[PDB]
Amino acid sequence: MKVGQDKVVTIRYTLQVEGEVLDQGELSYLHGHRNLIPGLEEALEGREEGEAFQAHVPAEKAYGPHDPEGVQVVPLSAFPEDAEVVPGAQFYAQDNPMPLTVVAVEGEEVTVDFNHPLAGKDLDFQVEVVKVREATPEELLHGHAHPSGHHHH
């Protein structure tokens, strides 16, 4: 069975950005419902069970460009008392939660980034297509594949 609209597809994958593994494992997803980044879904379209491939996905087809306006200076006083405010730390503002990543701390000022963590990055995937099956009515109703465990990290 080939990957296509309304199939539930199981893949194993490795995600690298500039030669570094950021994510890997196994997942199932409902194809054709914007559940994966568009460039990855495009690369998966028409693939067969048992087929391995590589996909280079430019930022535009992944998490989008990095907007300089998303990088801002905010007060250290805005962060929780029991917070570790250090580069890499993630926090939220409420707009729906808006995630931010701390990128620098300088005295009472903190530079933060509201961009997606992979904005502006090109993504390199190794993919194995493991299984392709029809979606159930419940999966179509919910717009995503049924839980099958947390098997990527």
Partner: peptide, 8 residues
């Protein structure tokens, strides 16, 4: 737009 506070 500036926010009052952030949460973990």
């Amino acid at each position: 737009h500036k926010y009052n506070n952030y949460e973990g």
